[PDB]
Design a protein around this ligand. Structure first.
Ligand SMILES: Cc1cc2nc3c(=O)[nH]c(=O)nc-3n(C[C@H](O)[C@H](O)[C@H](O)COP(=O)(O)OP(=O)(O)OC[C@H]3O[C@@H](n4cnc5c(N)ncnc54)[C@H](O)[C@@H]3O)c2cc1C
Lengths: 492, 492, 492, 492
C-alpha cells in the first residue's frame, strides 16, 4: 500500500500468469504498467518488418486489456537508451519498485543487469522472475553438474524432473496512479509504405493476449488428438499454430503444459490410446523451445563466436539473384515454392517445410546463411532469434543431433512425407494445380508429354529449376571438402 | 525411494490435485493406496441408502483409474475399528509413511487425531493436508482474531484474500509394492434387495473421478454464461449439477475456482458484461460450501448442543402418516410434490426447490426436523452432513441470515419465482399435466369448473391438500408463541 | 376471367397441391375461399373437444396464409344448414363456380350430392376432385371387378399399380373480389371454460398448413432411416408424428409419397440397405389410411349396420367408475397408464400403445366400446372417424386380419416389445419411476420386498390393479361363449 | 408385356423423371438401356477434353445405377454411324420399340429425324419426349404467333404461363432381357496421356446421377437464401454450382423448378422477405438456359450463318502467343488471371467472371472469338454449345440485350462488383497475395513504392500487363469503325 510499483514487460504481453503483475500488486497497491521502445540500442538487429506488425497489435490488445483490468493506460515511452527510460519513468511515476520479467536472449542478457546495477544504485528495488520459460535453464543439470550437448537427455531428465508451476490467476483488478500525463509517446512500428499491405496478416492470424488464450483452447479439442500421426503432414491444420502467440508470451507456456498434461490424463482413462502418445509428443515439441532457451543461455552465441562458426571456412557463391528467386515462388522446386509463397503471403509456414526451404538455402543454393536468417527474421511473426537460431543450427550440420550437412534431401519423397496427396502445393502454387501428384514435386523429371497433359510448360507457367539439382549435390560435396581441407590447414 | 508410503482417502476420490497422492510419491517411491469401511464406528449415523450407491461406483472408478496410473489395486479393508486397520495395513504393506487428507466433519474430527496419536506412538509419520476445501477454516479471521456469525462478510473478506492454490497435476504414474495379497475384503455398500432398483440413478447421474472432470468442463461452455439470470429457475438445466461430484471430492474445488475465474477473465475482455456477473455469482455459490465447512469447524455441532437447539422447546405433531405422504408425491402441493417425486426418482433436486420442500416439512407439516434430515441423508447423492446441516439451519429460523421461521411461503408466487411457465411440475407431475399454469401450483384455489376443464378431480388424480394451508399458518404462529412462551419460562 | 369462382374446404386445409384451389384460379380469375361451420347438422356426432382446438388454429393459419397468397380473407359463415350456406354465399359473393374437395366419410358422403343437386338446380357448376387420398377407393379393384376383404392384397395390388399424381405446386398468387363484407361470422370452436387448459397442446404440437410441411421434411432427414427397426418402440421419437397434420389435409398425402419414394431411391444407390426396407415399411403405414378410406367407402358403416355389429350379442358391464379409472392414469397397469396419462396430457399416443389401451378397454374392462370411441374422438387431435373406426375394428376381433378377440395380451412382454428398457413408463408415470424394469409393467407380480426397494406401495403411490388380470381373462372367455351361444340362438 | 423396348439417352443421364424410361417400361415389360458413341459423325466438333472426363464418369454412375434398378447393364456400342447402331441394336436386342429423349442442338436436330425416318421405315415405333427443358421452345409464342428477340418478355410471359410438369418418380425396378452378350464395346473417352492429370477434377467436382440430386438438395438449405445479394460475388460459394449436372441432365430441370418454387412458398409464409426475392432470381437464372434452347431452336445457328455473323467484317490480330498467355494465368490482369487459373485448374468458373475473361478475349486481345470458344468447349465441364453459344453472343455486341461491344470494362470496379475484398484473386493468384486490395486488380496503376511494400515486382512475380489497357481501348474503337466502315461498303 506504500507506493506505486511499476512493471515493464517486453516479451510477456499477457495479464494472466505474469509474475511481474503478481509482484507489483503484491508489494505496492498502486501499479502502473509500461513498455519501452529503444530499438537503435536494442542493437543490430531490429525486430523484422512483420514481427513489428504483430507487436503493435499486441500492445493495442494489451493497452485496452490493461485498461479494463485497471484503468491506467499502457504507457509508451521511446528513448535512445532503455536504462535511461525507467529512470525517466520512476521519477515521473513517483515509484519505488520496478518489477519485470526475465529474457534469456543475448541482446538483453546484459541489459537486465545494467537495468539492475544502474537502478539499484538509485535504491529502487529492481526485481524480476520467470514467466517466459518452463524449466529455468539454470535449473537443469547433467549427472554431476555439467551441461547437455544434445536434446535427447535434456528432455529425458526434464520429464522425471518435478512438475513446473501451475499458472497464476490474473490479479482481480488493478489501478494506476496519476497517468500524470507523464510519457505518452505514440510508437512507430511500421513504415508508412507497408501499412496497408501488412494487414492481410490479420486475415490468417489474429494477435492478442486474449486471442492467444483461445488459440490454444481450440487446439486441444480438435487438432491435438490426431496430432501424433499428422504432425509431419503439412497439408492440413495438423499443428497448434501457436508459436508467435508463445513467442511474445501472450500464451503462458505453463498454462499450456498444465492443459496438455490434463488432456493426456483424461484420454488415458478414456481409453484413447493414441491421445496419450499424441499428447506426449506435443509436449516434446514444446520442449524444443525450452532447449532453445537453454542453448543460448549455455553457449556464448554472441560476438563474435557465431552460432555457425564451423562453416566459417565454407565457400558459397555470393549471388544476389539466386537469393531473389528464393525470396519468391520461382525456384523451380514446388515444395520450396509453396512454402516460399506462404511465408511471404502469411508470415508462417509449417515447421517441417521450414527445413525444406531453409535447407534448400544453404544446401543447393549454397548461399550465405546470414541472408536466410534476415529474411526469416524480417518476414516471420513467430521470430525469436533464440529458437530460430536453433532451427538454423539443426538444419545445417551443427547440432550433434541435427541432420547431416553433407546430404541433400531428394524432394520427391521428402514431399511425400510432408504433402502426401500433394495439396499443399496447389493451394499456393496453382500454376501447376493440375499435373498429377506422382511428380508434382518433380516437374522436371516427369515426361514432356505429361507436362502437356497438365499444361505446365516450364518457362511459361512454373519456371525451370534454378541449379538443376544433380550438380549442386556434386558441388556441395566438393564445397564440404574444401571446408574439411582448409580447417585442417588452419589447425596448424 | 526408501520405503512404501501409503495414502488412505475417504472423501477425496480423485487422482488429480490430491496432495496425499503428491506426498506419498514424494517421500516414498513405492505408493500403495487404500480405503477402509468401518461404518459401525463411523458412528450413528451411517451414510444413506444412495450415498452408498454412489460411493461404491466411485471406488470402482477409483480402483480401475488407480490401477491404470499405477498397477496396484485399490485395497479394500473393512474392520470394526478404523484406527486398528491402518495398523493392520502398515505391517501388512510394510510401510513407514501414511498420508491422507483432512476432513472437517465432527464424526471424523476426532478420528484423525486418534489416527495420529495411535499412529505416532508407532513411529509412523502420519501427515495429511488440504484438498477438500478452498480457504482453510482456520485461515480466515474477523478484524481482530474472531469468527463470522453471518455469510456476508466471510465471503466479502475471502474475496480480497489471496488467490488459493492452483490445482496440482496428477502424478506421472505410480506403483504398488506387493499387493501382498494382503487385505482384499470385498465391500458391501447396498443391501441385496435394493440393488436393481438403485441403478436408475445411473440413467440421470454418472459418478466417477473422470465423469466429474467433464461434469464441470461441460458446464462452463454451456449453462455457466446465462446462469446469473436463471440460477433461480428450476425448470431447466440452470445449474452446475456438480454437487455430489464435489461432495466426495471427485472434482477439485480449486480446479473449479481456477477455471471459473478464468472464464470470467475471458468474458470481461470479450465484452460479455453478463458473463462476469454470472461468473461471480457462481463463485459465491461455491463459497456457500466453504462457509459450511467453516461453521461446523467453528461451532460445536456435536453431542449434544444440536444445530437446531433453539427449536428445542417447539411443539410439533409426531404424526407418522403426514410424513409418509410427504415422503412421496401426495401432499397436495405440486411444487413440493414434483420435488418429492424427483428426489426419490433421481437423488437430486434443485437447491431452491429443496427449500420449498424442506420448509414445507418444518413449517406446515410441523413435523420433527430430524425426520426430514434422515430422509435427505438417506435419499440424496450429494449428502454431506456439513452443507446439509447448513441448509437445514438457513431454512428454519436459525442462521441470522437464514429466512424467517415465522413466515410460511405462499406457494403460488414462490412457484412463479422458481417455475414460471410451470413445466417443472408436469415433467414429474403429469396427473395435472393439463391444468393451465395460472394455478398449477394452486389447484385448490382455482375454480371447480376449471379443474374439470383440465381433468384434475382432487381425490382421483392429484390428492386434496394435506392440512389446508391457512390453518397451519395460523398454528405455526401459536406454535412459535409457545416456543417464545416456554423459553422465557426456563430462562428462570 | 369471367367471374369469381369460390372454393370451400373442410378437411383439406392447405394451399399446396389443392386441386380445388387449382381449379378455381383456372376457370375464374377471381377466387374467394370459404369454410362453413354447421355442426348441429353435421350430425351426431361432433368433432371432439381437441379436434376443435386444432381446427381453430389451422383456420387461423389458413386465413393468414390465404390472405398472403391473395388478400381476401378466409370467409367464415356459420349456419344451421350447410347446403343453405353456399347459396347464401354464391349470391353474396356474386359467383358462378363452386369447387371443393371430396370427403369419403359417411356423414358427408350424402352431403356432397345434396350440395350438388341443390346447387346444380341453381345452374352453378359444382365440381370437386381428389386431394385427400392417394388411390381413389373406386380406382382399385379385385381380379374380376370385386372388393378386398383384407389389407394384404389391397396394398400388394396398389404397389404394382401406377404411380399416383405428383403434387401440384401452389398457385402463384390469388385474389378476392369484394370481401363485400358479406358473411364474417366469427366462429366458436371451444367452450370458454377449457380455453386456457387447452393450449398446452401447443407445447407438444404445433398445427398449421406450414407447420405440417416441415413436420414431414424434418422426419425424412432424421427418424425415417432407422424406422424399420424402431416403429414398434414407443420410448423414442420413432415415428412420423404426422397424423393430425395428415388428417386435416395440411400435409399432402402424395407430397409425402413422392418424397418418401425419392428417399428410398437415394438410399438404394447410397448402398443403405436398411433405408429401403425402412422406407417401404413407412409407405405401407400410409397405405393403412388409404385402406381406411376404402373400407368406409366399401362397406356401409352407417345407420345402423354398425362397424362392430358382431359384438351385438356381447354382454359387458355398464360400469361408469371402471371407465373413469380408465379415463385417467389409475388402472394399475403401467403401460396402459402412461398411455392414458399422455393421451389426455397431449392428445397423441403411439399407435402400438393405442392398441394396448384400446384393447384393455374392450378386453379386460369388458366395457361398451362406444364409450372408448367417444373419448378417443373427444381427446385426440388426429381423430378421423374413418381411420379411428378402422383401428377399433382391427383391435377387437372384426377385421379378418385384426388380432384375436379371444386373446388378452399379457402386459409384461407386450411391454418389452413396445418399451424395452421401460422409459416410456417413467416419463409419464414417475410415481414408480424407480422400481427396476424387470417388472415395471407388472408391479403386482413382483415381490413385496422389491416394491419397497423402490417405494411403490400400491394404494399410496400407484394404485392396485383394477380387475386383477386373471379373472377378466377367465370372464372374457365366458363372455365370448355367450356371444357364440346367443348368435346361434338367433340364427333361428 | 409384349416385347423388349429399348431407351437410348445422350444428355439425360438420370433415372428419375426420365420420360423415356417411363415410356419403355410402360409399353414393353422388358427394357434394356443403351448409349452410343459415334463421335466422328457426331460432327466437328467433338465434346472437349474434360466434357469427356465427366461423361465417362456419369456413364459409370449410370451403369451401376441402372444395374441396381434393373440388372442388365448399360450397353455401350461405338460405331461410325449412329443411325446404323440402333439398327445393329434392335435386331441384336430383339426389340420392337425404341424410345429416347429430345435434344435441341443443331448437330442432333437432324439426327433425331433420320433416327426416325430410317427407323420408321423398319416399322420400329421410334418415339421421344421432353426431359431436357422446362418450357418446350415451340410451346411459347409472341402475342400473335411470332418469336422473341430479347430475354425480357420471353420470361415475363413464361412466368404467367402454366406450371410445368412435376417430376415423374423413377420406375420401381426394371429388367433386361438377354444382355445377349450382344454389343459390349468398352468406350474410349480420354487419351491415355491425360488420364492421371484429369482426375483432380474429382477433387472439386463429383459427377453422377446421384451426386447431382444432392448437389441441389444441399444448395436449397444453404446458399439459396442469401443468393439474391451475393449472386454477383465470386469470392464465395454464392451460386448453385449445379450447371454441368444440369447440362448432362443428371439433375431434372423441373425437379429443381418444383423444389425452388416450394422453398419460395415456405419462405413467404415464413416471413422471410428476402428468400422470395432470392428465390425468384434463381428461377430467372434457370430461365436463361430455357431461352438458350429457345434461341438455337429459333434461329439457324448452323452452317454457315454463324452466331456472330455481325463481326464478320471485323479485323482482329491472328496472334498465337497472345492467346497462349490468355490460355494461362499470365495476362497481367488479376481478375482475368484468377479466372484463367481456375478454369484450367478445375473446369468451372463463376458466371460473372466468365464474362470478364471472355470479354477480355474479344475486347482487349482482339483475337478471333472462335479461339475462345474452343478452349471453353475443351476445358469446361458445363459445356453445352447451346448455352455457351448464348454466353458468347450476350458478351460481344450481338444480343439486343447483351452488353455493348464498344465498351471495354474497366477492371478496377468491375472487380469490386465481383470480388469486393479481393480474396478471389489470392486464392488462385497468391503471387500477389499481399498487395492491398485497393489495387489488387490494378497492379500497374498503383505506385512503385507500394508494389515493393507487397513484393510484386511485375516481371518477376506477376507479369506486366499484355497490351497496356489504354491502347487496346483506343484500337477497338478504330476496329469497330472499320466494321461499320466496311459493312456499309458491302451493303452495296
Ligand atoms: C434444505 C437444503 C438442503 C441441502 N442439502 C445439501 C447436501 O446434502 N449436500 C450439498 O452439497 N449441498 C446441500 N444444500 C445446498 C444446495 O442446495 C446444494 O448445493 C444444491 O442442491 C446443489 O445443486 P448444484 O449442483 O446445482 O449447486 P451449484 O449451484 O451448481 O453450485 C455448486 C456448489 O454450490 C454449493 N452450495 C450452493 N448452495 C449451498 C448451500 N445453501 N449450502 C451449502 N452449499 C451450497 C454447493 O456446495 C455446490 O457444491 C442444501 C440446501 C438446502 C436449502
Amino acid at each position: 500500500p506504500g507506493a506505486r510499483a511499476v512493471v515493464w514487460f517486453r516479451r510477456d504481453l499477457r495479464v494472466e500468469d505474469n509474475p511481474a503483475l503478481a509482484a507489483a500488486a503484491r508489494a505496492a497497491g498502486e501499479v502502473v504498467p509500461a513498455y519501452v521502445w529503444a530499438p537503435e540500442e536494442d542493437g543490430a538487429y531490429y525486430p523484422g518488418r512483420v514481427s513489428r506488425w504483430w507487436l503493435s497489435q499486441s500492445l493495442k490488445h494489451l493497452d485496452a486489456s490493461l485498461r479494463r483490468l485497471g484503468a491506467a493506460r499502457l504507457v509508451t515511452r521511446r528513448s535512445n537508451d532503455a536504462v535511461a527510460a525507467l529512470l525517466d519513468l520512476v521519477r515521473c511515476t513517483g515509484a519505488t519498485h520496478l518489477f519485470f520479467n526475465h529474457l534469456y536472449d543475448p541482446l538483453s542478457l546484459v541489459r537486465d543487469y545494467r537495468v539492475k546495477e544502474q537502478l539499484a544504485a538509485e535504491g529502487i528495488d529492481v526485481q524480476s522472475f520467470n514467466a517466459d520459460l518452463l524449466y529455468e535453464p539454470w535449473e537443469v543439470l547433467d549427472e554431476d553438474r555439467r551441461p547437455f550437448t544434445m536434446f535427447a537427455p535434456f528432455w529425458n531428465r526434464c520429464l522425471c524432473m518435478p512438475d513446473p508451476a501451475a499458472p497464476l490467476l490474473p490479479p482481480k483488478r488493478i489501478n494506476s496512479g496519476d497517468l500524470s500525463r507523464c510519457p505518452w509517446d505514440e510508437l512507430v512500428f511500421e513504415d508508412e509504405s507497408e501499412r496497408g499491405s501488412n494487414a492481410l496478416l490479420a486475415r490468417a492470424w489474429s494477435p492478442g493476449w486474449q486471442n492467444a488464450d483461445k488459440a490454444l483452447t481450440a487446439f486441444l479439442n480438435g487438432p491435438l488428438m490426431d496430432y501424433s500421426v499428422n504432425r509431419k503432414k503439412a497439408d492440413s491444420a495438423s499443428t497448434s499454430l501457436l508459436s508467435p502467440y508463445l513467442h511474445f508470451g501472450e500464451l503462458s507456456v505453463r498454462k499450456v503444459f498444465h492443459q496438455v498434461r490434463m488432456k493426456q490424463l483424461m484420454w488415458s482413462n478414456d481409453g484413447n490410446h493414441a491421445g496419450e502418445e499424441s499428447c506426449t509428443l506435443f509436449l516434446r515439441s514444446i520442449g524444443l523451445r525450452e532447449y532453445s532457451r537453454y542453448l543460448t543461455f549455455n553457449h556464448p552465441c554472441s560476438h563474435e563466436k557465431p552460432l555457425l562458426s564451423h562453416l566459417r571456412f565454407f565457400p558459397w557463391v555470393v549471388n544476389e539473384v539466386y537469393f531473389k528467386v528464393w525470396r519468391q515462388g520461382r525456384t523451380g522446386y514446388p515444395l520450396v515454392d509453396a512454402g516460399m509463397r506462404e511465408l511471404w503471403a502469411t508470415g508462417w509456414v509449417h515447421d517441417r517445410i521450414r527445413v525444406v526451404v531453409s535447407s534448400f538455402f544453404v544446401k543447393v543454393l549454397q548461399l550465405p546463411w546470414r541472408w536466410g536468417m534476415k529474411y526469416f527474421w524480417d518476414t516471420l511473426l513467430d521470430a525469436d532469434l533464440e529458437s530460430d537460431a536453433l532451427g538454423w543450427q539443426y538444419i545445417s550440420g551443427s547440432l550433434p543431433d541435427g541432420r547431416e550437412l553433407d546430404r541433400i534431401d531428394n524432394p520427391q519423397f521428402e514431399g511425400y512425407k510432408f504433402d502426401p496427396h500433394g495439396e499443399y502445393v496447389r493451394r499456393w502454387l496453382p500454376e501447376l494445380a493440375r499435373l498429377p501428384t506422382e511428380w508434382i514435386h518433380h516437374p522436371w523429371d516427369a515426361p514432356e508429354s505429361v507436362l502437356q497433359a497438365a499444361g505446365v510448360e516450364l518457362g511459361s507457367n512454373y519456371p525451370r529449376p534454378i541449379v538443376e539439382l544433380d550438380a549442386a549435390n556434386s558441388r556441395l560435396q566438393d564445397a564440404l571438402s574444401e571446408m574439411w581441407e582448409l580447417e585442417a590447414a588452419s589447425r596448424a
